[PDB]
Design an enzyme around this catalytic site. Structure first.
Site, short mmCIF file in Angstrom:
data_model
loop_
_atom_site.label_atom_id
_atom_site.label_comp_id
_atom_site.label_asym_id
_atom_site.label_seq_id
_atom_site.Cartn_x
_atom_site.Cartn_y
_atom_site.Cartn_z
N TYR A 1 -18.01 31.90 36.84
CA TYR A 1 -17.57 30.53 36.61
C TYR A 1 -16.34 30.46 35.69
CZ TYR A 1 -17.89 25.61 34.80
OH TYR A 1 -17.62 24.35 34.33
N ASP B 1 -10.90 20.03 24.48
CA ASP B 1 -11.16 19.54 25.84
C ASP B 1 -10.95 18.01 25.94
OD1 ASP B 1 -11.93 19.15 28.49
OD2 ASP B 1 -13.88 20.17 28.29
N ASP C 1 -14.20 24.57 37.45
CA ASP C 1 -14.24 23.19 36.99
C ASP C 1 -12.86 22.58 37.20
OD1 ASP C 1 -14.49 20.72 35.43
OD2 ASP C 1 -13.95 21.87 33.63
N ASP D 1 -12.23 19.12 36.84
CA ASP D 1 -12.32 17.77 36.29
C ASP D 1 -12.27 16.69 37.32
OD1 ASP D 1 -12.45 18.55 33.45
OD2 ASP D 1 -10.51 19.45 34.05
N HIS E 1 -16.18 22.26 41.47
CA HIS E 1 -16.85 21.00 41.15
C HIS E 1 -15.88 19.96 40.58
CE1 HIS E 1 -17.15 21.09 36.76
NE2 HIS E 1 -17.61 22.32 36.80
N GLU F 1 -15.95 15.87 38.93
CA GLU F 1 -16.83 14.89 38.28
C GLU F 1 -16.40 13.45 38.50
OE1 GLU F 1 -15.73 17.77 35.09
OE2 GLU F 1 -16.58 16.04 33.89
N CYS G 1 -2.71 4.38 27.24
CA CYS G 1 -2.12 5.54 26.60
C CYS G 1 -2.90 6.01 25.37
CB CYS G 1 -0.65 5.24 26.26
SG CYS G 1 0.06 6.30 25.01
N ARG H 1 -20.12 16.47 40.48
CA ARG H 1 -20.78 16.46 39.18
C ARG H 1 -20.86 15.05 38.65
NH1 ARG H 1 -19.20 20.12 34.04
NH2 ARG H 1 -19.76 18.69 32.35
N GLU I 1 -25.41 16.26 35.23
CA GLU I 1 -25.24 16.52 33.82
C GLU I 1 -26.40 16.03 32.96
OE1 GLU I 1 -22.33 17.29 30.86
OE2 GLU I 1 -23.77 18.63 31.88
N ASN J 1 -27.07 23.03 34.22
CA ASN J 1 -26.11 23.51 33.25
C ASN J 1 -26.79 23.92 31.97
OD1 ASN J 1 -23.86 24.12 31.77
ND2 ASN J 1 -23.25 21.98 31.49
#
Lengths: 286, 290, 287, 287
Positions: C41, C56, C83, C85, C110, C112, C120, C155, C185, C207
Site C-alpha cells: 500500500y 496531510d 490512496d 484522495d 481508493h 474518498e 481559500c 472510501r 472508515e 483500516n
C-alpha cells in the site's frame, strides 16, 4: 492491444511506412489527424527544442522520458524513440528498456556509437566494435518483457568503414535479437537495396534535410525495398522558422499584425485538440 | 548575479511599454532573447495545448507548468513571467506554488480571480469568485514570498460580466492585499486602459491576443494610454503550429518533404541560436594543452 | 502477462482476509515481499509526511504520489494499492488520475467521498459530499478506466458524522456507480463490519491503524466478521521514523554512533534483499 | 545567505562538524530538530532506498535530483550531496553543478573513480589518472556560478596506490579548484593527521559502519585535525531494521500489537512536522 503490436501492424499495412517526428504532444495529435500511422521522438529534437542545448549527449534518459510520456498520453499512434546508446552499461540499458515500455512507447532504437568518454573529449562520430554493440542489444532484448515491443539497431559504420562492414555488423545485430535495422547515411538507392537483401529484416531510411542523403520519394524507396521512411526533423525546423519570424516582426513593427496570416486559428486548435469531445463526455455521463 | 524578480522590475523601468513574448519551448525563449526582447512569458493554456495535448480546462497541474518553467529559465537569462491560474488549491497550495516558482528562478507570476474547483460534473467556463476571496489568495501568496523583488501580479476577468468599474474596484483591493501589478482582461478601447492605470496607480498589462475580442493595439497606442506591459502570449506558438501542420500535410500528399524545405530553419541557423560553438570554445579553453 | 489489477484480485481470492502493508519507499516494499505479503500500500499521508515533510492537509499533488508509486512498482512485483484522495479535481482530472496510475502499473486505487477544495482560508476539517457528488466521481473514474481488472475502491468517512446506516446506504450507491470494493472508515466494533459486508455484498477493507479510535483487531477477529482486506497502512513508517530519531539523538549526545549500531540492519542483509547478487548472474548469463 | 555560505559557516563554527545522512525529507527535519548544522544525501542511499537497487552506478542525476529537492524544501540546513562521477563528460558535469546549485544544495562531492565502461564490465572500484580527475574538477569549478557553493573532491586511491599517492592526487585536486577533500578508507588517526597537514584545506572523515574504518569519536577526530565527521548511513540502516521487524511481527502474529512500542507516536510526528504552524498562519492571515 500493445504499442509494439500497433507499430508492427503499421509496418505491415503501409509499405514503405511514413513516420514523422513530433517535438510536442500537440504536434503528434496533428500528425495523427493528417492520417499518419506512426510518430517519432528525435533525440537531438529533445535536446535542441525542450532543453535549449546542442546534441552533444547531454540529454538524459529522463529528459527523453518526460517528452515520451506527454506524447503517448496525447495520441494513440505508436511512437518510436531515439534512445542513443542507452545511457550506460548493461544495467542502465535494462532500466531504459523497461522505462520506455512502461511509458507506452511502441518501438525504440539503440545505436553503435561510443558511449561515455574521457571528461575533456571533444564530441565526434566513433563506433564500437560489433561485439560491443552485440552486448548492448543482448541486454536490451533480455530486459524486454513483451516481445511485440520493437528493438531497432542503428549503425553509422557505413561512413568510416564502408558499406560492407556495416552490412556485416547489421547481420550480427539481428543475430543478437534486433528486430529492425537503421543504416545511417546511405548515398544511393542501391545501398538500401543491397542492405535489405543482406539483413532480411525491416529497414529504415532516414530522410533528413540539409544532410548528405538526398530526399528520396516514397516510390524511390518502395522500389528499393525499404520498409520505413523517417522524416525526423522537418516539422520542428518549419515551426522554429515560423516562431523566429513572429519574434522579429514584433520587435520591428511594434505589433504582430503583419504575422497573423501565418498563424493557426482558435477553431483549428479546438478541432485538433479534440476539444468538443469534452463537453460531449460531460453530457454522456451526467 | 541579480535575482529574476529584480531583472523583471528593471525591464519594466527600462522599456515603456515593455514587450514580453510567449515561448512554448526552451529554444523559442532563446530566439526571443536573440531578437532583443527583455522578458518572456509562459502561457498556461500554452502548456496545456502544446506540452500536454489537452484543452485549457484546468486539467494542467502545477507540476506540468513547473517542468516547462524550469526548462526555460535554464535556457535563457531573461526574466520569465508565468501564468499560474488560481494557484492550484487553498492557501497552503498557493504558498507551495509561490515557493516552487521562486526556486525555479522565475521573476514574475500571475494569479487570477477565477473560481477554483467547481462541482465534479460541472461544465467548463469562466466565472469569478467574490473579491474578498481573491484578497485571501493574494494575502497567502505575498506571505509565502521569500524575496520582495519577486513580482506577484493579479489578473481579473470581472470586466466582462460586472462592468469596468466593478473591476477597477476589485483591482484596488488587490493592490491593498499586496499585488505588485494588475492584468485586466478583455478591455475593448484604449480609454478602458487609461482609466484603469489612473485608478490603480500600479503597473498595468495589456493582453494582445489574436482571434479574441481585444483589437491588436500598437506599441504607440498603448504608450499613449499609459500601459506598462504589452504581452504577446500566443502568437509564437500559433505560427509554429501552422508551419508544422503544413509540413505534415505536404509529406502525406507528395511522398516527400521537398516542397516544404524553404519553410524550414537551416542547421547553421539552429547552431547560431543554440550557442553551439561556444561549447567547442570551452572544451578547448578547458582541456587543450599547447 | 498478468496486469497489476488481476494480481490484486487474485490475491484477495487467495488469502482471506488479505493482509496488505504500507511501504513509504521502494526498498520497504521489497522487504514486504521478501517477508511473504501478497500486496502493498502507498499511503497518501505517508507520501506527504515522509517524502515531502509536510502534514496531510491536501497539499500533496497527483505528481507527488506518482513518483513514489512509480519507484515502488518498478522495484517489486506485488500489486500496489494507492490512496488517491479526491482525485485532484473535477471529472477531467479524475480521468487523468485513473489513466496515469494505470500506466504506472498500480493494481488498485481508493477514492474518498470527502469534499474537494473550498474557500481559500478554510481550516483543515472533515466533510462529506452528497451521495450524489461522489457517485459522479466514481462514474468518471470507471469510464476513464481502460482495463476492467484495475480495481476502483470507494472510501467513506460518513459513518463518523451521519451514523453507520447512512454510510451503508452511500456504499450501495457507490457499488451502483461501479466501485469494485468499499473502504469504510472508522468502525468501532466487529459487528459494524459484519453488517456492512452483508449489505454491500462486495469485498470490504478494514483500516487497522495505530493511535486512532479503531481497536487493533486480529486476523481471526476480522475473518469471523467477513472482512476481505486487512490494511496496515502506517506501522512500518512510524517504526522506522523512531529508529531514525534515536540514531540522530545518540549521535548528537555521544559524539559517535557506536551505541546505535545494534539497531541497524547489516550492510550484508541489505545487499541481499536488494538482490544484488542477481545482477552478477545476469552479467554472467549474458556475456 | 546561500546554502554554500551556510555550509562554510557551519564548518567554521563547529569542529569537527557533525553531518548526518537522511534518506527522506522528514528524516532531515528530525536531524535539524536534534540540533545538527548540516545533512547529507548519500548516493548509495538514494539507490537502495528510493529506487530498490544496488549501488552499481544505475542511479541517474535525476534520481538524486528529486530527493535533493524534497530535502532542501523541507529543512533550512545546508545539504551535502554525493554526485558520483558527475554522470558524464565535461558538459554533463557542468549541467550537474548548475542543477544542484538551483536545487538549493550547499556542497557537492565528486569522486575520482571510473565511468563508464564496456557494456558488460563487472562491479569493482578502480580509480582514474589523476590527470582525469583534475579535468573533472576544472569543469565543475568553471560551471559554478556562485563561489560559496562548495566543491569537494573524493578519492579512493589510498586503498590501491598507498597513502602517499593519494596525498599527491589531493594536492592536484586543490590546485584544480576543489574546496575540501574526502579521503576514503583511512585506517588510523595518523593517516588523517598527515593528510590534513599536506593538503591544508578542510578534510572529511567518513564514519561508516560495517566497513574497514574504525568508528572514531568526535574527540579522536578533533585531535587528528579533521574538519568534518560524516555519519552517512546509520540513520537508514536503523530505520530499515525497524521496518523489517514490523513486517515480520505482522505476518507472524496476525496483528501489529507487539510492534507499537517501537513506533514514534502520532503526537510526536505532528510536532516534528511543524503542524500547528499551519493553523497559526491561517489565523495570522485571516483573523
Amino acid at each position: 492491444i500493445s504499442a509494439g503490436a500497433k507499430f508492427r501492424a503499421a509496418v505491415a499495412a503501409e509499405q514503405p511506412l511514413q513516420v514523422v517526428g513530433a517535438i510536442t504532444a500537440y504536434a503528434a495529435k496533428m500528425a495523427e489527424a493528417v492520417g499518419f500511422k506512426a510518430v517519432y521522438l528525435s533525440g537531438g529534437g529533445v535536446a535542441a527544442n525542450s532543453l535549449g542545448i546542442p546534441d552533444l549527449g547531454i540529454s538524459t534518459m529522463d529528459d527523453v522520458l518526460v517528452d515520451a510520456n506527454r506524447i503517448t498520453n496525447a495520441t494513440n499512434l505508436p511512437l518510436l524513440v531515439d534512445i542513443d546508446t542507452g545511457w550506460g552499461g548493461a544495467f542502465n540499458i535494462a532500466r531504459t528498456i523497461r522505462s520506455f515500455i512502461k511509458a507506452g512507447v511502441g518501438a525504440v532504437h539503440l545505436e553503435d556509437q561510443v558511449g561515455q568518454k574521457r571528461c575533456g573529449h571533444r564530441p565526434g562520430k566513433e563506433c564500437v566494435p560489433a561485439g560491443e554493440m552485440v552486448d548492448r542489444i543482448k541486454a536490451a532484448v533480455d530486459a524486454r518483457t513483451d516481445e511485440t515491443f520493437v528493438i531497432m539497431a542503428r549503425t553509422d559504420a557505413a561512413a568510416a568503414e564502408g558499406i560492407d562492414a556495416a552490412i556485416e555488423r547489421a547481420i550480427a545485430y539481428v543475430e543478437a535479437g534486433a528486430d529492425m535495422i537503421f543504416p545511417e547515411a546511405m548515398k544511393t538507392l542501391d545501398d538500401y537495396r543491397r542492405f535489405k537483401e543482406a539483413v532480411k529484416v525491416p529497414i529504415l531510411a532516414n530522410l533528413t534535410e540539409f544532410g548528405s542523403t538526398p530526399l528520396f520519394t516514397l516510390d524511390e524507396l518502395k522500389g528499393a525495398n525499404v520498409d520505413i521512411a523517417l522524416y525526423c526533423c522537418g516539422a520542428y525546423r518549419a515551426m522554429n522558422k515560423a516562431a523566429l519570424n513572429f519574434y522579429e516582426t514584433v520587435r520591428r513593427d511594434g505589433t504582430q499584425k503583419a504575422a497573423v496570416p501565418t498563424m493557426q486559428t482558435r477553431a483549428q486548435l479546438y478541432d485538433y485538440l479534440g476539444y468538443y469531445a469534452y463537453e460531449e463526455k460531460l453530457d454522456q455521463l451526467f
